[PDB]
Amino acid sequence: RRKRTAVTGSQTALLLRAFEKDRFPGIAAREELARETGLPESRIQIWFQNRRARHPGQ
């Protein structure tokens, strides 16, 4: 178990917008999102994975 990352409302909103542009960001795009959101890139990867599995689109 790693410590569960607290994702804020504003962070979620920014991730949802990037998801609309590309559902499979590569590591460079994820590192950009990491810098923009404050989340570690590793956590952005997991966020996108879960999003794809649970709420694709909309």
Author numbering: 2 to 59
Manuscript text:
Furthermore, the GATXXGAT-like, TGAT-ATTA-like repeats are also frequently associated with wild type DUX4 and DUX4/IGH target genes. In order to gain more insight into the true nature of DUX4-DRE interaction, we have determined the structure of DUX4 HD2 bound with endogeneous ERG DNA sequences derived from the B-ALL patient RNA-seq and ChIP-seq analysis. The crystal of HD2-DREERG diffracted remarkably well (1.6 Å) compared with that of DUX4HD2–DREconsensus (2.6 Å). Consistent with previous report, one ERG DNA duplex can bind to two HD2 molecules. The electron density map of the last pair of nucleotides, T11 and A11, are disordered and hence not available for model building. Consistently with previous observation, the high-resolution DUX4HD2-DNAERG structure reveals an interesting Gln143-water-nucleotide network in the major groove. In this report, the 1.6 Å DUX4HD2-DNAERG structure demonstrates a strong association between DUX4 homeobox and TGAT.
The HD2 domain folds into a global domain of three helices, α1–α3, respectively. The N-terminal poly-Arg/Lys motif, perpendicular to the helix α1, engages the DNA binding. In current HD2-DNAERG structure, the QNR motif is also the major DNA-code-reading module. Taken together, the new DUX4HD2-DNAERG structure shed new insight into the DUX4-DRE recognition: (1) DUX4 HD1-HD2 might bind preferentially to the repetitive DNA sequences containing 5′-GATXXGAT-3′, 5′-TAATXTAAT-3′ and 5-TGAT/TAAT-5′ (the complementary chain is underlined) motifs.
